Design a protein around this ligand. Structure first.
Ligand code: NI
Length: 341
């Protein structure tokens, strides 16, 4: 049964709730972004409207095969009427095509649903600036003060350096990057750009990337592995036994892999900086963890919530245990008392 934090009061609207069957009263199903925990349930056999971004729409048509008529894409930053309810989609700074949604209720209440988001000061000069938001459905993935991590630009710096160093020291080394969903494309696109290469990938990953409206994408990616010295592999596969296995397949064309595992937070964020990172080394294969996040740090979330001064906050992540729920409420009370809303 669909949980209350996936429903919008005073509408027939649900958000990211495609896994419960028909939800009684729901005229419209919103999908914030193409990540399987949020889309779990969609197929070619959906014949209810789905509202989403253009980019999410392309992924729905081409990867799950939903029929063009039931995909209502909407432009961002555009006041749009949807069953006689004004809504806006705003960029979430998550993965490609990921959105937050502003709902303007008839009764005068305004609600923001963040979907998954990495809060940023550029949001404070968006359409949110123009009016009061009463309710906030919030991505609470990293709602605890241990959760710090660097800026994406810091991380992309490190990567561009590591890769370009090794490639120049040894010109027969391959760069690999791990992936399992959309997101974090900047990692591999930045490395490939510094090395004068395209990125090489399986057919299915090429298909996924050809849906994202990246400008110039035909110049940046290929399915021809032989022709490329930055390769993408499944994240499952980014280990020694799998990198060894893969290093065979290239057929004596490279004598050393240098891989990157973009991850979110791990416990080594508590005791080590980004300029002071190392990889595990079994022979000639070197695997980097790099903490590239597409979710708000604790401080980033805090600033956004304290600027927004919402009258009420409804968590959408880590809501399954009473301890997590309770811990989160305590932070929301501190923020409000500090900020005087
Ligand atoms: Ni996500």
């Amino acid at each position: 049964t669909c949980p209350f934090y996936k429903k919008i009061p005073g509408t027939g609207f649900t958000v990211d709730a495609f896994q419960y069957g028909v939800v009684e009263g729901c005229t419209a199903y919103f999908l914030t972004h193409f990540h399987s925990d949020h889309y779990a349930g969609l197929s070619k056999h959906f014949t209810f409207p789905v509202y989403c971004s253009e980019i999410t729409g392309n992924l729905l048509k081409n990867k799950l095969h939903v029929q063009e008529q039931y995909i209502h894409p909407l432009p961002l930053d555009t006041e749009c009427i949807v069953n006689g309810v004004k809504v806006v989609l705003l960029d979430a700074n998550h993965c490609p095509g990921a959105v937050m949604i502003l709902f303007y209720l008839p009764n005068g209440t305004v609600i923001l649903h963040t979907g998954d988001f990495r809060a940023d000061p550029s949001m404070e000069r968006s359409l949110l600036a123009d009016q009061k938001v009463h309710m906030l459905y919030l991505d609470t993935t990293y709602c605890s003060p241990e959760y710090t991590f660097p800026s994406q630009q810091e991380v992309i710096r490190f990567a561009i350096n590591t890769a370009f160093e090794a490639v120049t020291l040894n010109p027969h080394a391959l760069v690999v990057c791990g992936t399992y969903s959309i997101g974090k494309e900047k990692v591999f696109l930045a490395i490939a750009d510094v090395l004068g290469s395209k990125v090489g990938m399986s057919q299915e990953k090429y298909k996924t990337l050809q849906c994202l409206n990246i400008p110039e994408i035909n110049s940046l990616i290929t399915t021809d592995m032989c022709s490329s010295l930055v390769h993408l592999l499944p994240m499952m596969q980014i280990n020694f036994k799998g990198l060894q296995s893969h290093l065979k397949k290239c057929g004596g064309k490279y004598n050393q892999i240098l891989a990157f595992r973009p991850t979110g937070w791990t416990h080594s964020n508590k005791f080590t900086r980004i300029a002071d990172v190392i990889p595990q080394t079994k022979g000639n294969i070197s695997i980097y963890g790099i903490p590239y996040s597409e979710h708000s740090s604790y401080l980033e979330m805090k600033r956004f919530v304290q600027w927004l001064k919402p009258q009420k906050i409804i968590p959408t992540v880590n809501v399954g245990t009473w301890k997590s729920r309770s811990t989160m409420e305590k932070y929301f009370r501190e923020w409000k008392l500090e900020a005087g809303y």
